[PDB]
Every structure is written in structure tokens, then in C-alpha cells.
Enzyme design. Structure first.
Site, PDB file in Angstrom:
ATOM      1  CE  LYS A 147      -3.236   3.029   0.600  1.00 49.94           C
ATOM      2  NZ  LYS A 147      -4.205   3.426  -0.714  1.00 49.94           N
ATOM      3  N   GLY A 159      -8.281   7.922   0.364  1.00 52.15           N
ATOM      4  CA  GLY A 159      -7.516   8.817   1.179  1.00 52.15           C
ATOM      5  C   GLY A 159      -6.060   8.359   1.709  1.00 52.15           C
ATOM      6  CB  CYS A 178      -0.542  12.008  -3.886  1.00 58.16           C
ATOM      7  SG  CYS A 178       0.344  10.538  -3.348  1.00 58.16           S
ATOM      8  CG  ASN A 218      -0.264  19.898  -3.939  1.00 56.35           C
ATOM      9  OD1 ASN A 218      -0.640  20.902  -3.596  1.00 56.35           O
ATOM     10  ND2 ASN A 218       0.689  18.976  -3.353  1.00 56.35           N
ATOM     11  CB  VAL A 254      -2.548   4.520 -15.819  1.00 56.70           C
ATOM     12  CG1 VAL A 254      -1.791   5.044 -17.258  1.00 56.70           C
ATOM     13  CG2 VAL A 254      -3.867   3.643 -16.238  1.00 56.70           C
ATOM     14  CB  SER A 279      -7.799   5.262 -10.178  1.00 54.30           C
ATOM     15  OG  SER A 279      -7.210   6.442  -9.387  1.00 54.30           O
ATOM     16  CB  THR A 312     -11.118  -2.857 -10.290  1.00 56.42           C
ATOM     17  OG1 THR A 312     -10.615  -1.657 -10.043  1.00 56.42           O
ATOM     18  CG2 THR A 312     -12.396  -3.301 -10.018  1.00 56.42           C
TER      19      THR A 312
HETATM   20  C1  LIG Z   1      -9.031   0.699  -3.489  1.00 56.95           C
HETATM   21  C2  LIG Z   1      -8.050   1.046  -4.195  1.00 56.95           C
HETATM   22  C3  LIG Z   1      -6.670   1.816  -3.531  1.00 56.95           C
HETATM   23  C4  LIG Z   1      -5.775   1.989  -4.330  1.00 56.95           C
HETATM   24  N1  LIG Z   1      -4.669   2.677  -3.533  1.00 56.95           N
HETATM   25  C5  LIG Z   1      -3.592   2.948  -4.311  1.00 56.95           C
HETATM   26  C6  LIG Z   1      -2.385   3.239  -3.669  1.00 56.95           C
HETATM   27  O1  LIG Z   1      -2.137   3.343  -2.525  1.00 56.95           O
HETATM   28  N2  LIG Z   1      -1.237   3.624  -4.281  1.00 56.95           N
HETATM   29  C7  LIG Z   1      -1.308   3.466  -5.762  1.00 56.95           C
HETATM   30  O2  LIG Z   1      -0.439   3.695  -6.402  1.00 56.95           O
HETATM   31  N3  LIG Z   1      -2.689   3.286  -6.509  1.00 56.95           N
HETATM   32  C8  LIG Z   1      -3.511   2.871  -5.825  1.00 56.95           C
HETATM   33  N4  LIG Z   1      -4.595   2.429  -6.396  1.00 56.95           N
HETATM   34  C9  LIG Z   1      -4.572   2.434  -7.965  1.00 56.95           C
HETATM   35  C10 LIG Z   1      -4.457   1.007  -8.539  1.00 56.95           C
HETATM   36  O3  LIG Z   1      -3.007   0.810  -8.143  1.00 56.95           O
HETATM   37  C11 LIG Z   1      -4.553   1.012 -10.116  1.00 56.95           C
HETATM   38  O4  LIG Z   1      -3.654   1.909 -10.659  1.00 56.95           O
HETATM   39  C12 LIG Z   1      -5.824   1.479 -10.440  1.00 56.95           C
HETATM   40  O5  LIG Z   1      -7.052   0.830  -9.728  1.00 56.95           O
HETATM   41  C13 LIG Z   1      -6.156   0.941 -12.007  1.00 56.95           C
HETATM   42  O6  LIG Z   1      -5.942  -0.520 -11.914  1.00 56.95           O
HETATM   43  P1  LIG Z   1      -7.358  -1.549 -12.207  1.00 56.95           P
HETATM   44  O7  LIG Z   1      -8.188  -0.997 -13.465  1.00 56.95           O
HETATM   45  O8  LIG Z   1      -6.586  -2.834 -12.196  1.00 56.95           O
HETATM   46  O9  LIG Z   1      -8.178  -1.042 -10.700  1.00 56.95           O
HETATM   47  C14 LIG Z   1      -5.939   1.975  -5.805  1.00 56.95           C
HETATM   48  C15 LIG Z   1      -6.764   1.430  -6.470  1.00 56.95           C
HETATM   49  C16 LIG Z   1      -8.060   1.102  -5.708  1.00 56.95           C
HETATM   50  C17 LIG Z   1      -9.102   0.486  -6.246  1.00 56.95           C
HETATM   51  C1  LIG Z   2      -9.598  13.276  -1.390  1.00 60.74           C
HETATM   52  O1  LIG Z   2      -8.707  12.922  -0.663  1.00 60.74           O
HETATM   53  C2  LIG Z   2      -7.616  12.188  -1.003  1.00 60.74           C
HETATM   54  C3  LIG Z   2      -6.640  12.012  -0.283  1.00 60.74           C
HETATM   55  C4  LIG Z   2      -5.241  11.384  -0.451  1.00 60.74           C
HETATM   56  C5  LIG Z   2      -5.248  10.667  -1.538  1.00 60.74           C
HETATM   57  C6  LIG Z   2      -3.984  10.003  -1.939  1.00 60.74           C
HETATM   58  C7  LIG Z   2      -3.761   9.432  -3.403  1.00 60.74           C
HETATM   59  C8  LIG Z   2      -2.428   8.585  -3.440  1.00 60.74           C
HETATM   60  C9  LIG Z   2      -3.130   6.998  -3.107  1.00 60.74           C
HETATM   61  C10 LIG Z   2      -4.240   6.432  -3.930  1.00 60.74           C
HETATM   62  C11 LIG Z   2      -5.543   6.263  -3.715  1.00 60.74           C
HETATM   63  C12 LIG Z   2      -6.077   6.367  -2.361  1.00 60.74           C
HETATM   64  O2  LIG Z   2      -5.459   6.138  -1.478  1.00 60.74           O
HETATM   65  O3  LIG Z   2      -7.208   7.163  -2.440  1.00 60.74           O
HETATM   66  N1  LIG Z   2      -6.194   5.740  -4.656  1.00 60.74           N
HETATM   67  C13 LIG Z   2      -5.903   5.476  -5.941  1.00 60.74           C
HETATM   68  O4  LIG Z   2      -6.793   5.292  -6.719  1.00 60.74           O
HETATM   69  N2  LIG Z   2      -4.694   5.811  -6.363  1.00 60.74           N
HETATM   70  C14 LIG Z   2      -3.756   6.273  -5.397  1.00 60.74           C
HETATM   71  O5  LIG Z   2      -2.722   6.328  -5.832  1.00 60.74           O
HETATM   72  C15 LIG Z   2      -4.952   9.507  -4.153  1.00 60.74           C
HETATM   73  O6  LIG Z   2      -4.605   8.982  -5.508  1.00 60.74           O
HETATM   74  C16 LIG Z   2      -5.576   9.251  -6.588  1.00 60.74           C
HETATM   75  C17 LIG Z   2      -6.097  10.249  -3.961  1.00 60.74           C
HETATM   76  C18 LIG Z   2      -6.234  10.826  -2.637  1.00 60.74           C
HETATM   77  C19 LIG Z   2      -7.406  11.591  -2.379  1.00 60.74           C
END
Ligand SMILES: Cc1cc2nc3c(=O)[nH]c(=O)nc-3n(C[C@H](O)[C@H](O)[C@H](O)COP(=O)(O)O)c2cc1C
Ligand SMILES: COc1ccc2cc(CCc3c(C(=O)O)[nH]c(=O)[nH]c3=O)c(OC)cc2c1
Ligand SMILES: Cc1cc2nc3c(=O)[nH]c(=O)nc-3n(C[C@H](O)[C@H](O)[C@H](O)COP(=O)(O)O)c2cc1C
Ligand SMILES: COc1ccc2cc(CCc3c(C(=O)O)[nH]c(=O)[nH]c3=O)c(OC)cc2c1
Lengths: 313, 313
Positions: A44, A71, A131, A133, A194, A196, A273
Site C-alpha cells: 500500500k 485517502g 497523489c 495536491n 496507470v 486510476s 479492481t
Molecule cells: C481501493 C484502491 C486503492 C488504491 N490505492 C492505491 C495506492 O495506495 N497507490 C497507488 O499507486 N495506486 C492505488 N490505487 C490505484 C491502483 O493501483 C490502480 O492503478 C488502479 O486501480 C487501476 O488499475 P485497475 O483497473 O486494475 O483497478 C488504488 C486503487 C484502488 C481501487
Molecule cells: C480526496 O482525499 C484524497 C486524499 C489522499 C489521496 C492520496 C492518493 C494517493 C493514493 C491513491 C489512492 C487513495 O489512497 O485514495 N487511490 C488511487 O486510486 N490511487 C492512489 O494512488 C490519491 O490517489 C488518486 C487520492 C487521494 C485523495
């Protein structure tokens, strides 16, 4: 026939791994990912201190994919470093650690502490440039001068090969500028395309309501929605960064989808996902399905077709 | 129960219309859209001179949507002006004319010409900002300085209410900036969200090939892929532009999808990929489906739920 490969001075049983954030967060999750058939795992994304994350509900999934505004809930950097240093069984598969500090200073402080564990144990760093900003400023990967700052500072503090987790881009001039930033940094050995797709909005017709609580329902999209976006980004970076590996992430539900990622240029293929929805059993299905398609085509190796997507005339 | 709307000093039987580019380009197409049950139509984005567009194949569709790199094939401004001035039957429904000049000077030259016909006949202008500028720069609406320039020059040259077609944004900072630019221009009365999701890449697994010829297979995405993106953009502008209308476009295949648009804040709802795929009979289906949802919920008019969407907490 087997799907084993070697990258980054490590051996992988297959190109599959979780996407950061999915099935990672706790020691239990990490143990589960290690026990799975995946070729690797990533932790994570973490911050120096532990975080609760945003209010629930903060994830929801549907037939076409998922939306999240987690978050950055995480156990904090000391926990993930401890996992990397003391708990992970490297004999089982490689580990990547994802870092996502809220500032450049925070990232530099974490990477300085990671470095000796990387040297000793071989854990691999994935730096999350995706992330958001604060009001009046875009996320770092969408601000090219900031991105260059981050990478200069991390490269100096860390001093070892690392990779970067990228948000999607939608404009060719942005692909050209972002790849040019990345290629200034020789320690950036892999690019994961990529994250999300940012700030989508899912509405439920019956309730007339958004489906997640934070940010008035706005959150990152994953899953089927994003497969052609993911493939574009993989291929665009694969073309522009000939001296880096590209890791594919986005929209993988089947070995056919993995195949497409690899055709686009992916070395490893991350599952977010679909793994959240299916659980870690998915990795045996994906391996089987990818090997089936390879067999029907006559491919014996991933190298035979990586990056070999055909264009028309 | 009724779908009738009255906006921009026109009356519309229902909120549905084609998206620019689909079933608009020729006289034949425009007559067909006019004969359909749609509430309005828009013409193909035009340039001063006729264009053949990009090499074929340049559009393809699949179960979850479409990809295109059409390249602005169109009959030229003078044709669409003639249609507006001499051929369109305004008694059937209102007409929008979309323009997409390759430079700010081209757009000004066209809107100067369009003005007297807009005044006399009531044709409505939709200016396409999700469009090319100088090559190696981002499209116009992803370059906020160019976007301000275009709106200043067009506002001066045209001098009548118009609207703008926007690309999707993915970063809250971009929503904030873009909306603020738009809110500088009082003549911008409607904002259409969204154009295609840029530079996606569809790959066919069996052939191992991209599916369109231009730009090595990269093109804009429409359809089911983009609905949560479209919704987010509609809602983000609806919230930030309280003195403008927002028209929704993206991912509409059913009356439920339209309902979601309208809950997000849409006042007209445009249909691209699904119309391309199903044909103009779609409009009767969308009308019936939307009225059915309204009947089940007890809504008698669109204003009872437009922009309602509920948030959590
Ligand atoms: C619940 C959730 C948490 C995620 N948390 C992070 C994260 O901590 N760091 C990160 O680089 N991407 C995070 N992502 C993005 C995923 O790593 C991935 O880039 C994105 O979901 C697209 O891949 P998918 O189509 O397989 O879901 C998160 C995605 C989901 C669904
Ligand atoms: C609206 O409040 C917030 C706060 C912190 C956030 C931090 C990230 C980076 C971690 C992350 C998250 C996440 O932990 O929400 N979700 C993703 O789909 N990709 C991510 O890389 C983030 O990535 C898109 C979004 C966040 C949104
Ligand atoms: C074949 C094709 C041609 C298009 N041409 C234009 C155009 O000329 N001007 C424009 O504003 N948008 C154009 N678009 C974008 C559509 O208007 C619409 O914004 C996009 O397809 C998303 O809607 P959808 O999900 O209903 O397809 C085009 C789309 C398609 C598929
Ligand atoms: C040579 O490559 C080109 C040339 C011209 C282009 C013009 C446009 C604007 C028109 C348009 C097109 C189009 O005509 O190609 N397709 C869309 O999905 N939305 C649009 O707004 C365009 O929209 C993205 C893309 C274009 C790509």
C-alpha cells in the site's frame, strides 16, 4: 511452458502482481499476496505516519469497474519498512514498496531509510506520483516542474534504481513532456502506467445519490472503464522510454487483457479492481488464460510479443 | 409528465440531441436528425475549408464504446452556414452549429460570418475547444492561456450568446481553473461536457493490431467507457458555473444514463457513440425510458431533479 521472467535483477515466476492499494495494507494482506500465485507484490502506498484515510463508504465496484477515494489509509512507513526488512519471504517472490509522501521532503526522508534495506534485501521502490495536491495546484505528475523536482530529490536521496507510478495522460504533447522528464533520470528504471483515472463520478439512479462519501462522490476510476486509456499510456511510454521497463496497470480482468498490456509494451502486469473483486485466486486464472492464448498463437515467451502491437499501414 | 425545456430563448420538445460529429456531416445527415424525435441537432464541427479527414479506418465501435481519429472531415463552413441560413426547418427543432477552426483567426472569421444568421434565424453556436492548436502543444482547452485567448476573440467577434464544447478534466485543480476561465465570459451561456476521452488505444487480441489507422491507433474514446468521467465533468461545471447551463455528453445509451446526466446538472443530453451504433430510432427509446423513470419516481418535469444528485452526509 512457463511464464518466468527476469527484470530489475530479480526473477519473477510470472508477470502478474497486485496493483498498489489492493490487498496490501496490512500484514495479513501482504501474507496473503505472498501466498498467492502472483509473480510479485507491492505494498500500500505509505506516508511517514499512519493514516485513517477518508470517510466510508470510500470504495465501490460495479460491473464495469470501481471508484475510490480511499485517502491513503495506511499503517505508516515504519510498518512497511519492517515488513520489507524482517517479515517478507524473498524466497517466495519479489517485493515492491510504494511510497506516497504528501511533500517532497517526506518522500526524501522515507527513501533515505529504505535505501539500506533495498541494498540488503532487494525490495524495490515504486514512487507514487499520482497523489492530488491542495487548492490552486494540480497533482505532481500533472505539474512537470514539480515532477522533475521530486525525481531529482529522490534520485539523490535514494541513489538506487527505482520506478514511478504515473497517472494517465490524454494528450500527445503531455506524453512527450512527461516521458522527457522521466528520461532525465537514469535511476528511474520502470514506469507503471496507470493509476486510476482521476475524479470520475458514479451515481446510483435508484437512490439518486453518489456512491462514495468523500469529495461529494468524486474518486478515481479503475477496471473495465479504463483499459484503452491504460493501453495507450503503456504504449506511449514504451515508445518514448526505450531504456526503461513499463509496467502495465488498468483494466486487467483476464489473460486476454494481460496479453494486450504486454503487446502494448508491459513487462509486469498489475491487477487492482479485478483482484479486489475476485480475490487472489485470480492469479491462477490469469496465468492459465495467458498461457492458453500464447499456446494458440505459438508464442513460447513473453519477449516474442512484448511491445509488438501492429499499426495499420 | 413532460420532457419539454425552454432555454437559450428556444423551446425543445425533449433534452436529447446528437453529439457533434455523429450523424451531422452532410445535408442527408442533417435532414435525418431533423426528421428524428430528437429535441435538437448540432452540425459537424467545421473548418473554413472542406476537409477529407484522416485515413480510414478511423472509427471503430465495440460493446463498451468507440474510438475515433476522424480528423475533422467536414463540408466546410460555407455549407453549414447555408444549411443554417436556407435549408434547416426551425419549426421542427432548434439547430446548433459547431465550429472547430485550427487557429483563433479561423474561428473568428467564421463567427463573424455566423453572427447575422444567428441573429436572424436563431441558430446557436457551439465552439469546439477540445480541438488542436499548434502541434506539440496540448489541445486548446488543456492550455488555459490559449483557451482564454480564444474566448476573448470569439466573444468580441461574435457578440451573441454561445456555448463551448469541453474536453474532460481529471484533476480538481483543472476543474477550478477551467471554470474560472469560462466564468470570465458572460456570452458563454452553455458548456457541453464532455468531448471524447483523448488518446486512448484499442487493441484487437486476435490480430494483435490497433483498430484505427491514424496516429498509430490512438484516438478519442466514447461510450460506456466514459460515463463516470462525463458525469463528473457535468457536475463539476454545474457546481462552478451557476450562471451557465451545462449540457451533458458521454456514455448515454439509455434513459437511465440520461437521468444520471440530468441529476448531475445537465440541461440538454447529447448522444454520440450510441447514436452512431443504433441510429436515430434511439431518440424515441431514450424518451420512453426517461419518462418511465420519471413516472416511477413521481417526477413530472426535468427541473424537479436537474442537478439534484445527493451526496453522502
Ligand atoms: C481501493 C484502491 C486503492 C488504491 N490505492 C492505491 C495506492 O495506495 N497507490 C497507488 O499507486 N495506486 C492505488 N490505487 C490505484 C491502483 O493501483 C490502480 O492503478 C488502479 O486501480 C487501476 O488499475 P485497475 O483497473 O486494475 O483497478 C488504488 C486503487 C484502488 C481501487
Ligand atoms: C480526496 O482525499 C484524497 C486524499 C489522499 C489521496 C492520496 C492518493 C494517493 C493514493 C491513491 C489512492 C487513495 O489512497 O485514495 N487511490 C488511487 O486510486 N490511487 C492512489 O494512488 C490519491 O490517489 C488518486 C487520492 C487521494 C485523495
Ligand atoms: C465519429 C465521431 C466524431 C466526432 N466528431 C466530433 C466533432 O466534430 N466535434 C465535437 O465537438 N465532438 C466530436 N466528437 C465527440 C462526440 O461529440 C462526443 O463528445 C463523444 O463521442 C462522447 O460522447 P459519447 O460517449 O456519446 O460517444 C465525435 C465523436 C465521434 C464518435
Ligand atoms: C490529425 O489528427 C486530428 C486532426 C483533427 C482533429 C480534430 C478534432 C476535433 C474534432 C473532433 C474529432 C474529430 O473530428 O476527429 N473527434 C472527436 O472525438 N472530438 C472532436 O472534437 C479532434 O478531436 C479530438 C481530433 C483531431 C485529430
Amino acid at each position: 511452458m512457463c511464464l518466468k521472467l527476469n527484470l530489475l535483477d530479480h526473477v519473477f515466476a510470472n508477470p502478474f502482481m497486485n496493483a498498489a492499494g489492493v490487498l496490501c495494507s496490512t500484514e495479513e494482506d501482504l501474507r496473503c499476496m505472498t501466498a498467492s500465485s502472483s509473480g510479485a507484490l507491492v505494498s500500500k502506498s505509505c506516508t511517514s505516519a499512519p493514516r485513517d484515510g477518508n470517510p466510508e463508504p470510500r470504495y465501490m465496484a460495479f460491473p464495469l469497474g470501481s471508484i475510490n477515494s480511499m485517502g491513503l489509509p495506511n499503517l505508516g512507513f515504519d510498518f512497511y519498512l519492517k515488513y520489507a526488512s524482517d517479515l517478507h519471504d524473498y524466497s517466495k517472490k519479489p517485493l515492491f514498496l510504494s511510497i506516497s509522501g504528501l511533500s517532497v521532503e517526506e518522500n526524501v526522508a522515507m527513501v533515505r531509510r529504505l535505501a539500506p534495506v533495498a541494498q540488503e534485501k532487494g525490495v524495490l521502490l515504486e514512487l507514487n506520483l499520482s497523489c492530488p495536491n491542495v487548492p490552486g495546484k494540480p497533482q505532481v505528475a500533472y505539474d512537470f516542474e514539480a515532477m522533475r523536482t521530486y525525481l531529482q530529490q529522490v534520485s539523490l536521496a535514494y541513489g538506487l534504481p527505482f520506478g514511478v507510478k504515473m497517472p494517465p495522460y490524454f494528450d500527445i504533447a503531455h506524453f512527450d513532456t512527461a516521458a522527457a522528464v522521466l528520461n532525465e533520470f537514469p535511476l528511474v528504471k520502470f514506469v507503471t502506467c496507470v493509476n486510476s483515472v482521476g475524479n470520475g463520478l458514479v451515481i446510483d439512479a435508484e437512490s439518486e445519490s453518489v456512491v462514495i462519501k468523500p469529495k461529494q462522490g468524486f474518486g478515481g476510476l479503475g477496471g473495465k472503464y479504463i483499459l484503452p486509456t491504460a493501453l495507450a499510456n503503456v504504449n506511449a511510454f514504451y515508445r518514448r522510454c526505450p531504456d526503461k521497463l513499463v509496467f502495465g496497470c488498468g483494466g486487467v480482468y483476464s489473460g486476454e487483457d494481460a496479453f494486450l498490456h504486454i503487446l502494448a509494451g508491459a513487462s509486469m502486469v498489475q491487477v487492482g479492481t479485478a483482484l479486489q473483486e475476485e480475490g487472489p485466486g485470480i492469479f491462477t486464472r490469469l496465468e492459465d488464460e495467458l498461457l492458453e492464448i500464447m499456446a494458440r498463437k505459438g508464442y513460447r515467451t513473453l519477449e516474442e510479443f512484448r511491445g509488438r502491437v501492429k499499426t495499420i499501414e
